[PDB]
A and B are shown apart, each in its own frame.
Chain A
Amino acid sequence: RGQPMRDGHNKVYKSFSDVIEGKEGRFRETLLGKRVDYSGRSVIVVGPS
C-alpha cells in the first residue's frame, strides 16, 4: 500500500502476505523445522573413556 495502515500505537498491520513471507511467517520456520518432541537439552562434558 502507498499508505500502509497502522494501529493506534502506530504499529504496521501484519497482513496475510506477511504471515507467509518472512521467517516468522508460517512457511520457513514452521515447515523447515519443528519443535520436535522427545528432546532434552543440557550441558555436555568430555567422556574421554
Chain B
Amino acid sequence: DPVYPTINYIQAPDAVMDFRGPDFHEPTPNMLSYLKENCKVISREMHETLLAKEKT
C-alpha cells in the first residue's frame, strides 16, 4: 500500500465542492460592496440628497 493514504485523493464523483471548506479562501466580496462598506463610494441616494441640498 502507498505510505500516503489514497483516501486523501478519493473524491465522490458527485460533489457540489463546498467552497467554505478549510482549503478555500474567504468569499470574494462584490467590488461595489466592499467600497460601499468602507465608505469609499457613496450610494446614489446620498448623492441626490447632497445634490438636492445645494439646489436651494
Question: Do any beta carbons of A and B sit within 8 angstroms of each other in the complex?
Answer: no
